[PDB]
């Protein structure tokens, strides 16, 4: 049989087989628990539901995301994970060898418990769990780098040498995609607009796709926005209206850089970069330095590379070679490393099977 | 063995279950004598339903126990009920299931006290009260749609999506078949004419159901009234007074699209529709678009689903597929659904009994 | 002296400076004619607004032109304000500094197009607009505090601090005062009733701001108005009878606190209040949690300042001073937050000029 990958974050999870280097279901991780008895506009009323009918569902169910980086709740990530092998997946796994990924600091008592449940709950003849970050490099062609992972949740930083990523200098940072949708949220709501219930929030973040960038040089661009007409970059909104926004645009996501828009002190993405080159020893610095590699949801935005090749240099001593790679895949590339991973033959010997568990 | 009881704002339909077609019928009337004599045949008398009192009808008082098809009177009702088994019927209430139909906002005092009724006087093995528009869906077999059930009382539209009937996104509109029967007479007499006893009081009833339009175009069917056309359609009284009806056949009709005929400043049911599919969710709306199912009385109109299928597909994304379904029997749909569920092979786990009822009370049903 | 207008989605408020109560207190209402006469009776003036059009309702088309706090309708707007000059205050717009409001979540030209009626067409010499809930706060004696200003169409909750609104978590909730009593409407029907019109919706709209109440804890009450006619509030109808009001006198209110019964997919005013403190930062926090302003006639239904006590220091920590602030004026307190604001002889510097608007334009507020 094929193994199975599912790479799981505060939003989307990616779920599929090994073999493809393509992830097969993508999806929220939402289940919608019944908040009181509630009807559906549609539907009957039913129990917990996982997915986009559940965001359809938002006044009878109660809605969590299961994974805040971590896994919060542990009955709604298996009401994910049965919805995963069957709902998308189609299949049954006592057949089927699966990845769960996970995002690196992960406490033991978690790896523990993740362990039990997808060897008991669900049955899968062998399984593993691994390190997001460091399957984002491998899936980078490295060995070796230092990967800023950022998506809907939760922001990273891993200076890998030689198979590890270093531990203790694993940096990082909770403000990432959630934070900056609620942001651009908030702007647009000053100036005389409120989304709230469930299809306007999810414009606003569609808007974030592409309307927003993070420009070079905040004061400059601060100016230019506030000056002349260029950045002034429309959308046609569901009801008819074009929001015209220049400013708010690459303001939104200058809260990875300074925070201290919403209101966050604690080191920005550059800045835990700078720091987690450092936090290691010292010489590898240059080969992290060099293999800046961005991945996940956030790292999307438009510009980004190019601000953080300013970034670092600001701070790094003159004769270190900064380089910010950045695949074109990046929202999976977590998925697409532990697929590859998952069917390495050379890995077989590390699949934990049903017995000696 | 199973039997089905549809209680309406006009007429009871009862039988058993499985029949294709209402074995009793009657009007939902319930009168009383005002004058202290015997009709010879009976003794003394407590009260009329059905057709004893539409015969009665002027030495009696008449009254609606159900206005609108929420029950109104329990008085009246459990009279209506007594009639229902043992004279129309003949039969023995406690030996039969006994499904019935209730309203789409009906609360829960009128599904439980109507069971209360059902078990602890009239003594039934088991009952079931279920939701009209539904059982409509359930006639035209399928489990997803928006149902608009227009009868004697009321008119609704009733979206649902698998089996449940969907209490925020029913419409109510409460003008129906009576609304658009007395305003024909109006205008018909208006149009010259006087219905001043009871059969044509009667007859403009008739007048109605028989030979009236939504004609499909009104206004360039206006200019073919003003024009004069042969649309005119005379028929005769009691006497040999031949009434000629021609334009108003199509502009009493014309109430279930614009309440300003009669006086309602508020928006005609094809909006209404629309409205309720805005209200429902975007992924189902699909379906509702094209499982829009009409039912009751009134909707039986020469012209109604052609008429819906022009406004609302006026009012939709171009995108969208669009289809009113109005099955050839709308009239007592609520019925054989009820008839068809009752006979189900799978239904009988949700028959309803005694000992359901008495352990858990009222609340159970 | 000034004058300030709040001009509210039910009933707006003008007057001038430095009164202590507003002097053009009136729904905002404009009444045109279906057909303009020529005598009363059928309509001689082409627009009536406020009361005036609310006991002429029959020939009249009522409108409100203000939803949510924003005016939809810019036409019937400046009829309001033609009004209250000259009909309702007796005065003269260009003779005047008018301060006029708008409700936080107002758009540019929503606000342009009302700061260039006041200067181009009533060309008073001075104008300032106002954010409800800043003036809100300036009634109660605060520079920082967070403000359910739950008005009649719109409730706002705005977290204020050193006199600027942090908008940054102005969560606004679609449910308030109308949405309310549409939910008595329906509730009082179900416990056999008939308020369908007008006439019979305002007696529904009176009933709430007499007879009802917020529940401390929704279970104990539910219990107690099914057992203990002590709940029962009987009511005079005008036109002579004697009704019993009872479980639906909290459970209507319950509506802000459970959108869910609605079927609104909201949470409640009380949760919105905390998720606006948490979308702050963790300084004022404090503050907030400790200087709730309370503003506005949804906020003054019998145990609601003290239900909203109980929840919110339950929503936030265990060590935490909540604290609600209820003025009895809350009513007004918009308007008297603005009445101290147009007469202060410090602010007298903020009138923006007439000529400053005509060499500025309307964006400079």
Request: with cysteine; glycine share 8%.
């Amino acid at each position: 049989t094929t193994a199975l990958v599912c790479d799981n974050g505060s939003g989307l999870v990616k779920a599929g087989f090994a073999g493809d280097d393509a992830p097969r279901a993508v999806f929220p991780s939402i289940v919608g628990r019944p908040r009181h008895q509630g009807v559906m506009v549609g539907m009957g009323q039913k129990d917990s539901y996982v997915g986009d009918e559940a965001q359809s569902k938002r006044g009878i169910l109660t809605l969590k995301y299961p994974i805040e980086g971590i896994i919060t709740n542990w009955d709604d990530m298996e009401k994910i994970w049965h919805h995963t092998f069957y709902n998308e997946l189609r299949v049954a796994p006592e057949e089927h060898p699966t990845l769960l990924t996970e995002a690196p600091l992960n406490p033991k008592a978690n790896r523990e418990k993740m362990t039990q449940i997808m060897f008991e709950t669900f049955n899968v003849p062998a399984m593993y769990v691994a390190i997001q970050a460091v399957l984002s490099l491998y899936a980078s062609g490295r060995t070796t780098g230092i990967v800023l992972d950022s998506g809907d949740g939760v922001t990273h930083n891993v200076p890998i040498y030689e198979g590890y990523a270093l531990p203790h200098a694993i940096m990082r940072l909770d403000l990432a995609g959630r934070d900056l949708t609620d942001y651009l949220m908030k702007i647009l709501t000053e100036r005389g607009y409120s989304f709230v219930t469930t299809a306007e929030r999810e414009i606003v973040r569609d808007i974030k796709e592409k309307l927003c960038y993070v420009a070079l040089d905040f004061e400059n661009e601060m100016a230019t926005a506030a000056s002349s007409s260029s950045l002034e970059k429309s959308y046609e909104l569901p009801d008819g209206q074009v929001i015209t926004i220049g400013n708010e645009r690459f303001r939104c996501p200058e809260t990875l850089f300074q925070p201290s828009f919403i209101g966050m002190e604690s080191a920005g993405i550059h800045e835990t970069t700078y720091n987690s080159i450092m936090k290691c020893d010292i010489d590898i610095r240059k080969d992290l330095y060099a293999n800046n590699v961005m991945s996940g949801g956030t790292t999307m935005y438009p510009g980004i590379a190019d601000r953080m090749q300013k970034e670092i240099t600001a701070l790094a001593p003159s004769t270190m070679k900064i380089k910010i790679i950045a695949p074109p895949e990046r929202k999976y590339s977590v998925w697409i490393g532990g697929s590859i991973l998952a069917s390495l033959s050379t890995f077989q010997q590390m699949w934990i099977t049903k017995q000696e568990y």
